[PDB]
Symmetry: D2
Subunit: 385 residues, 4 copies
Amino acid sequence: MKIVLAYSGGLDTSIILKWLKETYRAEVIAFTADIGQGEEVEEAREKALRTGASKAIALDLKEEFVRDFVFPMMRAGAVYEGYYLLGTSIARPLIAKHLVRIAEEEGAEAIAHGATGKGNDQVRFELTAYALKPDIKVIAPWREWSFQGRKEMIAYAEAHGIPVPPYSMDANLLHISYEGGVLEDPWAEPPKGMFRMTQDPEEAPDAPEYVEVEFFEGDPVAVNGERLSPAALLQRLNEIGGRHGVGRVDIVENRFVGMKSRGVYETPGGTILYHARRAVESLTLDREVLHQRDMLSPKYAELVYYGFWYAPEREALQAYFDHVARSVTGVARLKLYKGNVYVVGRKAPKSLYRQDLVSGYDQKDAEGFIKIQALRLRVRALVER
Amino acid sequence: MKIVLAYSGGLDTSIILKWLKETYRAEVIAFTADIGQGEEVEEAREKALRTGASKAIALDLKEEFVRDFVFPMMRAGAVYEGYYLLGTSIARPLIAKHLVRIAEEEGAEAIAHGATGKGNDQVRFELTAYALKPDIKVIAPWREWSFQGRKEMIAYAEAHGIPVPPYSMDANLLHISYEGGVLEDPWAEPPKGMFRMTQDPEEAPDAPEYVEVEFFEGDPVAVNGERLSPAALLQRLNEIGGRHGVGRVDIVENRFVGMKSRGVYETPGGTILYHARRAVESLTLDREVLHQRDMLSPKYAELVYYGFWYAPEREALQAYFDHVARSVTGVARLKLYKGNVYVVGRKAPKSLYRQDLVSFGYDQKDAEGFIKIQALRLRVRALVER
Amino acid sequence: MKIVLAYSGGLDTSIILKWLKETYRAEVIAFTADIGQGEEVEEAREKALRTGASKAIALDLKEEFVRDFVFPMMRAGAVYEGYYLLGTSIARPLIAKHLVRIAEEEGAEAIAHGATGKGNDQVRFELTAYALKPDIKVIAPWREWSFQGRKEMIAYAEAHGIPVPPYSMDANLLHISYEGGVLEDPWAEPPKGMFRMTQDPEEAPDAPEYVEVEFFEGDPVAVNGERLSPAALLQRLNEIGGRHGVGRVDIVENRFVGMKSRGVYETPGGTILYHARRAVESLTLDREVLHQRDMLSPKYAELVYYGFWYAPEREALQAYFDHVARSVTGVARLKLYKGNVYVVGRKAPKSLYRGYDQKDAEGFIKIQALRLRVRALVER
Amino acid sequence: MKIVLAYSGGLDTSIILKWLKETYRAEVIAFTADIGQGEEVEEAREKALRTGASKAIALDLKEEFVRDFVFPMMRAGAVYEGYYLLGTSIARPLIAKHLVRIAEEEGAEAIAHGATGKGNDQVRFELTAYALKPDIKVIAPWREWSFQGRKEMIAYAEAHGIPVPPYSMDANLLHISYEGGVLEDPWAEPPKGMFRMTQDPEEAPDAPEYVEVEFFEGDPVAVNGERLSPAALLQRLNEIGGRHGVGRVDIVENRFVGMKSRGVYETPGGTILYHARRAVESLTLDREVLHQRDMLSPKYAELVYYGFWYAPEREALQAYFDHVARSVTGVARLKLYKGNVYVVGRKAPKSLYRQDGYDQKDAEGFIKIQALRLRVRALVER
């Protein structure tokens, strides 16, 4: 039996690697992916080989992540419950896709992940695993084992000789999320110095910095004139935005599994891309199209949050969002200043804006429009007798 | 005949007042409402008599504005095209309402407004008027007169003796709108020194400031522990959020009548109220209710933006939103800092949040069955594709 | 330990009653409700006592069903996947509601139902059970016992003294449902003679029959001029509609739990009410209100179908639907003929049926066409 | 000056042809199109020349009408206010499209139509015209002329040598609508023998007829095993369903311009296609996809109804509907009997149906999770 584990190199997935061997007595192929966590994956790959893995793969997936996941999602204008930019949600699908491809190639019947039983990640990993390979077996150590608390786990580690050391966190090119620990009290403010991706607004530059993002077809292709690849472009905007402390969100979200959770997120580049995109859409999209797209954004957002990336519903909606996003061509000019992003200007080759209509229709026309529109309201008032 | 005019004391409405006399030879009843423009509505009232009005009425409508218009709209989480909080939109209905009411009391055949022929305000003024009094006659001078240019208008104003003088403005307790002039070029940043309700970020305090807002039933009822009337509460939050430069929006919006239009708005209090409400909703509203409400907000928003406030569709959605808002009870804690509004805390007497369910009534193995059932249709799909 | 059980008197719920006593060494309180199944609920009640029930309750819930579940759902104009009028779905919340109530009165810690492990009813039963009483324990024998098959269940029944007698069914005042057996092949037409609540359209009367339905506030209050209580009114329209073979549906539906299921439904009375309601709305509802309402109905139908009746989302939408329904006041006139229902007339006290001139229309057109022209010009 | 006129050969469009020449001092290019009205279009074309057109054009647009308008719309499951299958609405964009095409080729600066100045049809003609040629000049005689009565119009027609002749109708391959006259009383049942496209159910065959419709990719491609082109297939189903009196609707609909109007429609072929399509989707479409689609259908329906066919919104939705419809491959079996259509069977190569992935225990976990938020709500309400 072979098991492909999403190995991160940390304490838990390390414990998990030992646990899969003793419990299933199978070969555990460890898989670590670089998606922008700011970590040397080869260090995790080597530690994997030492922790017992029979094989350990480490792939650079920054470009695929941004190109095939972050961007398609951004074109939809996806935002979960008002502020969540789905940093962790779009990542999981990519990883599960690789676990299944690897198992397929290694002749492994199962894949494993270290997501707990109380979160969305288990569902995200699994829903995409079963969607891509229906007969794949999935092992979720957190839902199967007996450890009743941290203490027991440290001991099991030492017992197996495994390296050992507030809140937990997830990071990638799109963001860093912080949850648990002192964060569980929704009336409690995130502790000083918790953030890592963005600088503290209070320590941000005293002079605003302007940035321009060009969109060609629904996707950002250049920053301040320099053409950048998807992963390269997101990286650049993280640097520029992070320096100004942009993209901080503090929310109590609704998990798919039934309960509420207090989360804190920092998405510098993503927050700039969010506003830059809408700025360009303000000139390139027709009113009615925009109004319809916006009413569907929320649904697409929960589809991603819940883990339905490789679900026919999302791919259906994606056909709609992509059709609309195709017209988003132009440039956005934003002003970054102490934790904030301000749209200050935008332009587009095929802008629908013309200061002459506000500088083919005249006064009288507006009158008839009003009459026709008011008819049903007048008949109503009259009938209300 | 009698004509009730929405008179503001400004140059254009003064010109209109004279025009209504000269053209219709009508007795003109001027109406000025203080909805928080920061003007001395009484001065406007006296000016109207000075300009020819046969009667001048000045009312303080701050409270009615925030309690019967602003609040109901906020409950719905209304946001036009992602950023506009509808400061100008919700005010129009209120004014048309009183114009129509004053016209009936005064036995006046018609009412008149000063909205141009290229905007949405005319639609907003008239849809409300026709909805409340189907038999009402409406006169829109901007659409009826022959003037062409500010040159001609000023001449005509100079002629009749009406006192004479970069962008156009509109203000009330909720916000201040800026558009036209140097603002017409979408690629041009707004000019330094334009904002009047909000301090500029670069000049905001160096220390962050915390503020708390209590919601009892969908409506904000207090700030930092002090109970305040709707109008006084918005006022208080404009001051607090204003000194920090909170609530500035710069967008190109889609009009109902014209094409696109570049607008700049400052809504200090409203912006604080928008994030506070959602913070209290994050504890008091059910997941599926919240997701559904958010999918209807955009529609409610365009209804308000287009002028359909006293229209059956908006009253129907209002029933849905009022039903959901009744649960929003609690307190939000925000950190204001240099143009930004950060939610740092929230609490509610009937909070649906349970740390016990997240920390390390919930059985981990239940999730596996949940997952397998959810995954079924997806596995069948793959299998059929083979 | 006590357990309240949804008892129908059938073979399975009878076997279940025995199973519960033995498996949980519990005192079983049987509950049978008359919601229009066309059975003598008192015989099920007596049979439960014979089978071992420590108590048996039988209630006539036909009025509560129609007025508190069927009617509110109809105000929403709810239709699941284009055709299903939700007969089974709106009934379960009511049963589970009473199971929990009776359990509270009897000091029982658990309730039980006979829904299978792969169906949707188990969800409907339990979703409302947990929503009304979060501390309740639910026992679903189909998911907990070992029975390897029919033959085995039958032998179990015989051994216990339960009397042992081609498709599953479910009936109530709203409809009768059929599935399984020959019906499991979506390419096979339902067998001749399967239908019970409605006459075969090929055997329907040679002359069409007219019917009038009055609505006062979203709810039908009379038929052909005679005021009738909610249950009485549904009964009457089932008679009139049934005799003509009206209300037959044959669909392949998407289940909440399983995959796809093939079902046949007959809802004579509710089908008439469906078209009668929309006929009245056509004169009383505002165009924009109607369009928004119809865009929300599907979501509501889905909530009902899944079993989210006592869920906050359905209740939120209900406030909207009810608000709209308040204006539905008037009379719909229909013509029934061999399986079909035809709206033939409608009138209302506050009808919006029968301002501007031709020049007004041109301006309307110009303003509406503006963004289109700009787009065309911009495509240069 | 040249004016392309949507000419039908009737009294009013003939009168309009004369009115246009004199009022605008221009020549008129008459355009008549056959979209299934059952009239000989070539005769209207010759009458146009006789009436004064400098050029009369007559085209057979049946296939384009069904292939590019009817079909695209049906894939969206479009139904206006519960029953209207939009027979009049999807036909206008097609006609206006050709008026603007002929205008560009003939060097005409303007086009004209005979829609009334108080109805919805005018909006349909003009919205697509302006959307396709923003600079086109549109002349609507009914909104512009000074005729004050029917009588005066007859005298004008007689004066100009134009031959002169309880409800008004409109027909094409999809349906035939009826309105006005005795039909204006919403409480009055339509007059006997009014229907033309469908036999009265009382006179329909005593024997039910089974029909099988094959869908390949969201569009019907065969009836009872016989492959048929789009127009040929709609014609076939009109004959079959019509013989049984299928597809009659009687509704008071909400207008885009004006209030409400009582209309009666007969759409035999389209009604069969409607159920046949859903029958195949019941086996080919994913649950969540189907639910989403149905929630967008109403919106699409009003776009088509109001006349926003060549509008970006409609085309954006069409991208969604076409994506979904592509999976609709299979065959639907329907039973037709005295005015009704009954789905009695459906099959598909990629059916997602297996009379047959989880066990009982799975079902319980599912319930638990789904019920959590509800239980929490109850505990909180204490």
